Amino acid sequence: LPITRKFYAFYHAPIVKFWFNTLAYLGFLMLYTFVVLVKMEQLPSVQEWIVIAYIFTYAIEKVREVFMSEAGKISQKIKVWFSDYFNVSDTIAIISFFVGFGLRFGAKWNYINAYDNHVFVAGRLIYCLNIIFWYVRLLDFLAVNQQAGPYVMMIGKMVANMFYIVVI
Amino acid sequence: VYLQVKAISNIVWKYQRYHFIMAYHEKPVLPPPLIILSHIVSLFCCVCKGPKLFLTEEDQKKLHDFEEQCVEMYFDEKDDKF
Amino acid sequence: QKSWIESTLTKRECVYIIPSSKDPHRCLPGCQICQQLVRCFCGRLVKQHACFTASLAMKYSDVKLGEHFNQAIEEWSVEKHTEQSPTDAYGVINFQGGSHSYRAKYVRLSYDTKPEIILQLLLKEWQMELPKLVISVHGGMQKFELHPRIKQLLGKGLIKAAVTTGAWILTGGVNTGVAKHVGDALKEHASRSSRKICTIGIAPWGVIENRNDLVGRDVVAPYQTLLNPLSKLNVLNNLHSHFILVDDGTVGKYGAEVRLRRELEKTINQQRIHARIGQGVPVVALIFEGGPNVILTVLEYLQESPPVPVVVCEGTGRAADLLAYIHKQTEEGGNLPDAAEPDIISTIKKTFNFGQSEAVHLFQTMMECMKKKELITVFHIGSEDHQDIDVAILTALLKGTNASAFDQLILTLAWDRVDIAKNHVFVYGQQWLVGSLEQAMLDALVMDRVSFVKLLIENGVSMHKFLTIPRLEELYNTKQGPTNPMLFHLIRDVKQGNLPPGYKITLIDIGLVIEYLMGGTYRCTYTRKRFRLIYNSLETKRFPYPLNELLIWACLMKRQVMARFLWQHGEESMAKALVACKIYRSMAYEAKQSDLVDDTSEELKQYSNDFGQLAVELLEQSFRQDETMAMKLLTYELKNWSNSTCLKLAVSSRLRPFVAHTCTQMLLSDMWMGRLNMRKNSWYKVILSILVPPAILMLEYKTKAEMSHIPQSQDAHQMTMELPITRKFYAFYHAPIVKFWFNTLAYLGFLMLYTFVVLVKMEQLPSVQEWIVIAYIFTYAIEKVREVFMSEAGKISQKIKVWFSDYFNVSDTIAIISFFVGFGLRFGAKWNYINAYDNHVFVAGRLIYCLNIIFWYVRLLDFLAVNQQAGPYVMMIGKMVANMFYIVVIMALVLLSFGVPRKAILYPHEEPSWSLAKDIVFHPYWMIFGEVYAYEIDVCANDSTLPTICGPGTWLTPFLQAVYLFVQYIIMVNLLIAFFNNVYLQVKAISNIVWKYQRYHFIMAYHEKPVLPPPLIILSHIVSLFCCVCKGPKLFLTEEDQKKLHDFEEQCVEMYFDEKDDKFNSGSEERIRVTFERVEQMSIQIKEVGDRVNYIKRSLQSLDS
Amino acid sequence: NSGSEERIRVTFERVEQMSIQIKEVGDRVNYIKRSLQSLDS
């Protein structure tokens, strides 16, 4: 097999696209964990810019997934994609992040002490809560294993079945 | 309830492994930071220019035989057991 | 042309047009009705020709101006006047029937085709396998329907002799009479012989309907089953799978393919039935309900090189029945009684009116036939006369060639028909040649014909005289049967990689493979010096135990059914079952460790696990018979299997059900005791007698006769010849039970000291405890080095890789290496004299001790795992840690999903610090264990212990922690309870077996150990080095006890096979099914005795007359 | 006695004995139908 053919065989394999996305996603959380645990100044740090860029482009991808999906009726493609658990979480996670960035970046810094501006606080506290969506999304990557994945689906089938015991 | 939710979850897991694997044939090659290049390149070639099983005509013949031969063995072995 | 056919085969087009009778039918104008009517002496009218020589000729008159001189009318012969041209009809017809689209392969060839060409088409193009038999059916047409029973029998028998002998039933094709009954017979016994019987109808292109439809080069051409309401024409029949559509002229003329059928009845005769068999493919003729020209055709067969015999089916029809009676009423090989012509010619007359002009002319075609009775056969239907025609047909080709029984046998061997060999070839009076059954055996072994290998042994073939070196070399170097293609990949991997093209495998090369697949110190009979000499020189070339050399052959060639045959034959059954388990297990590992399209490992591991179960089921058989001798069956040296041991072979294959069998576990229990009877002693007294030496001489030992089934050391066996005092101490201290408790007390005393050194102040120099402690670990390490050297396979790397596979032996190296780092830092460090722990080399040394000790408590689980109850729980713990892994990874993610939002909301003003990696993980982990941090929740409350953390957004954290614990405690901890409850029983069953299995390696390690524990062991080490530069257990039987044991082995294998059938036969599934089959046979007979009595009650009023 | 294991096994053993006899009464009647053309003499 020639050389340039041998690269086209690697990068276009679904196994490679996976691990090439996991490392970007794990590197993404390591950065977004860092931005959320460390002091957040007036302007976003280089981490937080790398982090916004991911979520922005990650959202362009989801839009592209919905268009290039299946049955040409726009409403059908919609109703299919919003039936998976994590794809609902992705929209809340994407929408919530750009509210928080709008409030974070769109806010008059006080210069005496941060967190006297409640637009700024509200922006950060959305980040600190939006990140929960992005750890739980690792269960979608871990659900690629033959042993792990059935436990992940199982958790939810049990939460639904224990409901009435928990109401008592 | 463990055993029966574990049996359902193994099947729902195996079933959703189609939609997952087949979604990673359509995805670009670059992950979501650098994906935008792949997006732009796919818009360039949109205003400038899924997987299928290719058989030669003799392999289609050998396959339709295999289909027929296995249906025969199915009905034959169903009565031979009954 | 993209078809071998078109370049090769042709058609026939009647280029030349000739008059008919010359009468224009009626209707005065004659010139044009000549065009309307005149069937060419071809047989199709002038315009049906369409020929190019005859297309632009009708304008003038046609071919042949005017009368053409009556002589020359008698000149159309297709040869001069009909042209060979490219085929135009070859494809696949399709029949319209219930769920079967029955296919075929029509060809449309000229009758002039060379007979070589035909057989080629049949074999390569149509991809047919050369048959082991050809049943050419010849009979009469439109023979309405046979009687119900006689149709059943000719419908089961033809199918049974064609499905078992892979035969080509050559036919006529026309759906009338013969092909009509052949086809219905196929349909009544189809789908068991569907893709096994190939039925070639050789039909003419004359009497053929939808003739124009079959035309079409390379097509899936259609075809019907609606018999044309008006027509004398004939339709091809449903179930014929192939068609030879000969063409010379047109419709009618149903006599131009007869010669071509004869060609294919010849060209198959010149092919060899099998690559090893010299006999030609047989050909037989089957007559049922014939015709006037059958008895002519019958005559032709029995007068050729060689005489194609004939099997006639009386009771069906006219010619058969005629031919039935005549040859039946014949002299032994000749003429008749006082002239029988009056009845014969009268009998011939009623079938066919001939009338003494040619009714005599039949008597000549009817004499040479019956004169050849030896070649003629007849199936007397309704008289159990060779049990449908399958016996009779196949029999016909064995009795009627005056052939040697060597050839008659080999034909059955190519047919795989043992019954016809055992009932007609091995019959009384048969006289064989010196080594002819041997040549049959060699062919049966190569061809993988187990049922003939059985027969040839049962009659007289001795495998001791049979099996030689140059022969048993052949058996490896064959491609004429089921082969293991990996045997070359193995013989490559041992002979450095180089295999020349020929490379006739040698037994020495097979010995090298058996050493590599059996591993360790195994030395085969083929790699020895005594064989490499006799071998390269070439009773001596005959092996002493031949059925042990072929068991390996059948296994290396992946021939299980032959392996499961040759195993019952001979002795050392349980040994061979555990070898085979080992050969297939290693063959399987090297198949998975290689690149290949067919993995052939689930096949081999199943083959391994099939013999592994035979050994266990024979051990359970020996154990239920005698327990003491069954334990002896585990430890006697084999002497044909590299001085090995049936137990050692099972441990070599990780065949846990055999080592976990109660017999081995009870022998293992008795080797643990030693010479001590721990049934009339207690562990209190063993410990007491270790601490009080003279209490060794007050406890109960075992006699020499309670130690005969136990493998011993030589020195131990030399002290069973005499018990004196110094002998009584040698029996105590060398018992594995005593070496254990003598090591536990040193190890428990070791931890008590090392616990003391680690809890108490550690001064500049080590205390007397810490010196005693270092000494142990130092000498304990010397022991582990000695364990690795004196272990097993001489390859240093193997001994390494085995010892580092046990859990605790990995821990021992970390524990030993870590201790002498800590001692090097502890002892190698400048004491400060102001206060210790200002020197960080010294601290680091102590903190390694304080952590190294964890290795040494956990090592007590290795001592506690000696108990039958405790040990399976210890192995179980680890099997569960591995299985709970992914639940705990989810629990670690819910942890970080909570600790990162919490630390971020409660500590917003943090610069980057390593304390951020603790605080996201610390409190959320201690929450899993019931610490709620109650007064840190709601940091803005009045009872809060973190009142300074109160700020914007901190009201979120109690909501977050409420979700957190609900997930961790109410879902995830209880999911893990649910996990354990539903996996408990099966991990507990595995752990009991893995426990019982590893009790071999443990007990057998305490035979090799010195007598002194790891502090004082160094004496035993030194003494063992002194006697190394100055100077395991075996089962000793006397020669009469070896005799009594080989008997016990034989007797228990017999009881195993006997009791296996006695259970199978005495089962309701077997008793319902043979009852089922008898009630069938009876019912048939009851409606036949019921018929006869209906032919008796008619004979009450006839006798009344 | 009133169990299927016992009723299959004695049925099994009777069908054996019968079948033997049915191929012996079947033999005798084959030695009777020969005695239709002999008595005919």
Ligand SMILES: CCCCCCCC/C=C/CCCCCCCC(=O)O[C@@H](COC(=O)CCCCCCCCCCCCCCC)COP(=O)([O-])OCC[N+](C)(C)C
């Ligand atoms: C599957 C895929 C799904 C896709 C889902 C995607 C959904 C995306 C959803 C998006 C929702 C976005 C909501 C943002 C909220 C803004 C409010 C705000 O901050 O107001 C403040 C800033 O007001 C300003 O005008 C700031 C202007 C400078 C900053 C630029 C804003 C960037 C917006 C981001 C663009 C996001 C890009 C989105 C890309 C996707 C006002 O507060 P103040 O200034 O303190 O007081 C003003 C009053 N005064 C005048 C009296 C003083």
Ligand SMILES: CCCCCCCC/C=C/CCCCCCCC(=O)O[C@@H](COC(=O)CCCCCCCCCCCCCCC)COP(=O)([O-])OCC[N+](C)(C)C
């Ligand atoms: C299955 C079986 C497997 C077997 C596995 C066995 C594996 C065994 C593995 C062994 C690894 C051993 C690693 C030890 C680390 C030593 C480093 C150290 O302490 O350095 C210090 C002492 O430096 C000295 O030179 C001290 C010399 C006196 C003490 C003697 C050391 C004894 C080593 C024990 C021999 C162990 C015997 C092993 C027997 C087996 C340096 O620090 P300092 O002095 O405070 O400062 C110096 C700085 N200055 C120069 C500027 C002043």
Ligand SMILES: CCCCCCCC/C=C/CCCCCCCC(=O)O[C@@H](COC(=O)CCCCCCCCCCCCCCC)COP(=O)([O-])OCC[N+](C)(C)C
């Ligand atoms: C198969 C099993 C393998 C393990 C797998 C799991 C990986 C485990 C990895 C865990 C990460 C821990 C990283 C430590 C961060 C640096 C620590 C440090 O700098 O000093 C601290 C170390 O001293 C201590 O006392 C704390 C040590 C951590 C204890 C962990 C307990 C929880 C277990 C968690 C288990 C759940 C894990 C969930 C998944 C991630 C001391 O305090 P500080 O403030 O940090 O620094 C000093 C400053 N000061 C003097 C002012 C105080």
Ligand SMILES: CCCCCCCC/C=C/CCCCCCCC(=O)O[C@@H](COC(=O)CCCCCCCCCCCCCCC)COP(=O)([O-])OCC[N+](C)(C)C
């Ligand atoms: C069953 C029992 C419930 C009854 C039903 C009715 C609901 C009742 C609720 C009603 C909400 C209104 C209460 C606000 C009171 C005034 C503001 C105030 O004091 O805020 C306080 C906090 O609280 C907050 O800041 C807001 C809390 C909102 C979440 C409440 C739960 C929502 C419903 C359920 C959600 C579950 C999920 C929903 C899906 C199912 C501020 O006080 P602090 O925190 O001590 O800090 C002050 C000091 N500082 C200035 C330094 C910071």
Ligand SMILES: CCCCCCCC/C=C\CCCCCCCC(=O)O[C@@H](COC(=O)CCCCCCCCCCCCCCC)COP(=O)([O-])OCC[N+](C)(C)C
């Ligand atoms: C979108 C796709 C992302 C994919 C990744 C690619 C992008 C990543 C590449 C580059 C981005 C990083 C830019 C760094 C800029 C400098 C920052 C700075 O000033 O100092 C910081 C340095 O930086 C760090 O310590 C790293 C911060 C992020 C933590 C996670 C890194 C791993 C994740 C991603 C990679 C792993 C791969 C994951 C695969 C398994 C901190 O400095 P400090 O010394 O701690 O400060 C002293 C503290 N003091 C003041 C209290 C004394």
Ligand SMILES: CCCCCCCC/C=C\CCCCCCCC(=O)O[C@@H](COC(=O)CCCCCCCCCCCCCCC)COP(=O)([O-])OCC[N+](C)(C)C
């Ligand atoms: C499509 C999806 C939904 C989008 C919803 C819309 C989102 C955008 C919403 C709102 C627009 C932003 C308002 C601008 C602020 C005006 C007041 C101001 O100037 O500053 C004041 C802010 O006082 C506060 O109380 C700020 C609270 C902001 C957080 C609330 C939004 C949470 C969104 C829910 C999450 C949704 C996540 C997505 C869920 C899927 C005070 O600061 P200052 O003025 O600088 O100085 C002090 C002056 N003062 C003391 C005299 C007061």
Ligand SMILES: CCCCCCCC/C=C\CCCCCCCC(=O)O[C@@H](COC(=O)CCCCCCCCCCCCCCC)COP(=O)([O-])OCC[N+](C)(C)C
């Ligand atoms: C610069 C960077 C350098 C490199 C970076 C290295 C990064 C390392 C990255 C990842 C670590 C895992 C490596 C093991 C992979 C094993 C192989 C595999 O594919 O197994 C499975 C895993 O399939 C997955 O999709 C796993 C996804 C892991 C991401 C989730 C992290 C969990 C964090 C939560 C925990 C919190 C604690 C986290 C710590 C704070 C899939 O295999 P399978 O489907 O079974 O197919 C085989 C089937 N067969 C056996 C029949 C053939």
Ligand SMILES: CCCCCCCC/C=C\CCCCCCCC(=O)O[C@@H](COC(=O)CCCCCCCCCCCCCCC)COP(=O)([O-])OCC[N+](C)(C)C
């Ligand atoms: C701060 C951070 C905290 C930690 C983060 C933890 C992250 C989360 C961790 C793990 C997530 C597990 C992955 C889910 C897998 C998919 C399941 C799915 O699609 O839906 C499942 C259901 O729906 C659910 O199960 C909903 C999600 C359950 C999360 C549990 C929240 C409980 C807390 C609230 C209480 C708190 C009390 C306190 C209140 C203040 C599928 O169900 P089904 O049976 O297939 O079909 C349903 C239909 N039926 C009903 C007819 C059967």
Ligand SMILES: CCCCCCCC/C=C\CCCCCCCC(=O)O[C@@H](COC(=O)CCCCCCCCCCCCCCC)COP(=O)([O-])OCC[N+](C)(C)C
């Ligand atoms: C390598 C294999 C080893 C095998 C064992 C053979 C070697 C063992 C033999 C001898 C070694 C011991 C030498 C002792 C030297 C004197 C020490 C000293 O000065 O005082 C110590 C005395 O000693 C003890 O109290 C015992 C210390 C070890 C702890 C337990 C040993 C038991 C295990 C081994 C034996 C049983 C085996 C059990 C088996 C089931 C302590 O004195 P104190 O009075 O506490 O101090 C007052 C405290 N105050 C200052 C605060 C007031």
Ligand SMILES: CCCCCCCC/C=C\CCCCCCCC(=O)O[C@@H](COC(=O)CCCCCCCCCCCCCCC)COP(=O)([O-])OCC[N+](C)(C)C
């Ligand atoms: C083959 C297996 C691997 C072996 C690895 C190699 C092992 C050997 C490793 C290292 C060799 C020893 C180095 C000597 C110390 C040099 C510094 C010194 O002299 O003193 C300094 C010590 O300062 C420290 O920080 C000491 C820390 C020592 C512990 C680290 C080793 C842990 C090994 C991991 C465990 C592995 C266990 C085994 C795992 C299987 C200071 O003390 P001082 O000088 O007296 O006075 C103060 C002066 N000062 C304040 C100005 C500074």
Ligand SMILES: CCCCCCCC/C=C\CCCCCCCC(=O)O[C@@H](COC(=O)CCCCCCCCCCCCCCC)COP(=O)([O-])OCC[N+](C)(C)C
């Ligand atoms: C100077 C000194 C004087 C004497 C000292 C006396 C020293 C006393 C020494 C030991 C105490 C145990 C004595 C009971 C023995 C019972 C008999 C036996 O063999 O049972 C089994 C134990 O087999 C073992 O190997 C047990 C090993 C014990 C060491 C682990 C200690 C646990 C510490 C952790 C706990 C922490 C707490 C620790 C304390 C802080 C083996 O038997 P079996 O395989 O079942 O074979 C019989 C089968 N049958 C029934 C079918 C026939």
Ligand SMILES: CCCCCCCC/C=C\CCCCCCCC(=O)O[C@@H](COC(=O)CCCCCCCCCCCCCCC)COP(=O)([O-])OCC[N+](C)(C)C
């Ligand atoms: C300080 C003192 C602490 C207390 C001391 C305790 C001492 C320990 C006590 C008892 C030890 C139990 C004896 C083990 C028996 C042998 C098992 C074996 O060989 O391996 C088993 C596996 O591997 C293991 O099970 C590894 C050992 C498990 C120890 C548990 C550590 C968990 C802590 C970490 C988390 C901490 C979180 C916090 C992080 C900071 C066998 O597995 P298998 O199934 O046969 O085969 C595996 C292959 N498979 C995967 C395909 C199935």
